[PDB]
Structures are given as C-alpha cells and as structure tokens.
TrEMBL record, chain A:
Domain of life: Eukaryota
Localization in the cell: Cell membrane
Source organism: Rattus norvegicus (Rat)
Leader sequence segment: none
Coverage span on the entire protein: 183 to 242 of 761
Lineage, highest ranks first: Eukaryota, Metazoa, Chordata, Craniata, Vertebrata
Protein's name in the database: Transient receptor potential cation channel, subfamily V, member 2
Automatic annotation (TrEMBL), chain B:
Cell compartments where the protein resides: Cell membrane
Residues of the full protein shown: 303 to 363 of 761
Coiled coil: none
Gene coding for it: Trpv2
Signal peptide: none
Organism, scientific name: Rattus norvegicus (Rat)
Record protein name field: Transient receptor potential cation channel, subfamily V, member 2
C-alpha cells in the first residue's frame, strides 16, 4: 500500500464533528499513531524510514 | 433463573460455539477492532410482548 498508494498523513476519524466517529476506540486518528498504539514496532520503523513517503513524527 | 443456579444460567445466556453449530448460539460477534468487541445478544429474556420473562422471574418470583 505504501509503495504506490495513499499518503501517510490521513486522519482516521477526520471530519469536523468529533463526537461522531465509527468506533469508540480513540488512538490518535493517524496511521503512525495507530501503529504506535498497537505495539507494531516493525510497522512504525518502516513508516518512519521509507523512500516513498516519510511520515513526520511531529504531524498533528 | 428461578432456582438461583447462576453458573449454568450465565453460560446459557452467553453461548457462542463455532463451525457447523452456529445456529445453537445466543451471542454473535459482529466485528472486532482493537479492544472494541461489538457483539449481538439474543433476547428470549425481554419483558416486552413476552409474559413471564426472565427479568420478572428474577425480580419477583
């Protein structure tokens, strides 16, 4: 997916009305935050360093 | 429910199984996403349009 696909700065719940989300699991609304919260060390390691779309760790 | 036996009452209340015995169940897991485990329970124990329900039996009898 990362090789030829979507950008990494894609908010998960997104939208403008925070009280309406698809699931009550709050993780950070980001792929990097989702990987970090679920103890995916290999996934976060790949996301930080990859020569197609680096993920800024300071992304809000 | 009436006799006070809880250990088998709870199991009958939450019966899942797997494989060919799917219809013999009362608790169907819809989807799982992290800690969230949204499921569907069966209602043979609802007072509405059901006289002599489990709720009344626990509460009164």
């Amino acid at each position: 997916l990362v090789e030829n696909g979507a950008d990494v700065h894609l908010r998960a719940c997104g939208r403008f009305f925070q009280k309406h989300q698809g699931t009550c699991f709050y993780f950070g609304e980001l792929p990097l935050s989702l990987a970090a919260c679920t103890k995916q060390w290999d996934v976060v390691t790949y996301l930080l360093e990859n020569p197609h779309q680096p993920a800024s760790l300071e992304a809000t | 429910a009436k006799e006070g036996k809880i250990e088998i009452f709870r199991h009958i209340l939450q019966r899942e199984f797997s494989g060919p015995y799917q219809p013999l169940s009362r608790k169907f897991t819809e989807w799982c996403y992290g800690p969230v485990r949204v499921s569907l329970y069966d209602l043979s124990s609802v007072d509405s349009w059901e006289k002599n329900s489990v709720l009344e039996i626990i509460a009164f009898h």
